[PDB]
Design a protein around this nucleic acid. Structure first.
Length: 118
DNA sequence: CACCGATCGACT
DNA sequence: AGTCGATCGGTG
């Protein structure tokens, strides 16, 4: 099932829906949603350790996010009990995906390929 | 210094 | 109007 999680992400990068995403934030959201469905638990853990200095990065409610940082442009993550801040440059959306994908035990080359498409 | 925040400009 | 997200000022 790690071989399967890898296959899935690889398929996603090839999928039409992924291609359909117009901007980085759009790909970012679809990356998160896909990651979850693969392993809700691991995504839960990987997420606890993911936060900023003064901003929470992930929470189960728009409220918590809007409450710790100034403007974070929170956005619910489709098919998920989570919310994530969106007011971040591309390099930081990559850091986030990297953190999460390392925690979920994905190979490095895949992570590198994923981030390169954000 | 390397990392983070969030303003405010670019593009629609 | 609204969204995105690079740039640059903060900070530890």
């Amino acid at each position: 099932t790690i071989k399967d999680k890898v296959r899935a992400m690889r398929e996603l990068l090839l999928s039409d829906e992924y291609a359909e995403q117009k901007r980085a934030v759009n790909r970012f959201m679809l990356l998160l949603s896909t990651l979850y469905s693969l392993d809700a638990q691991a995504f839960a853990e990987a997420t606890e350790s993911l936060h900023g200095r003064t901003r929470v990065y992930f929470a189960a409610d728009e409220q918590t996010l809007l409450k710790n940082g100034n403007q974070t442009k929170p956005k619910h993550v489709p098919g998920t009990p989570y919310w994530v801040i969106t007011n971040t440059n591309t390099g930081r959306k990559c850091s986030m995906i990297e953190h999460i994908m390392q925690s979920m035990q994905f190979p490095a080359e895949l992570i590198e390929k994923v981030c390169g498409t954000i």
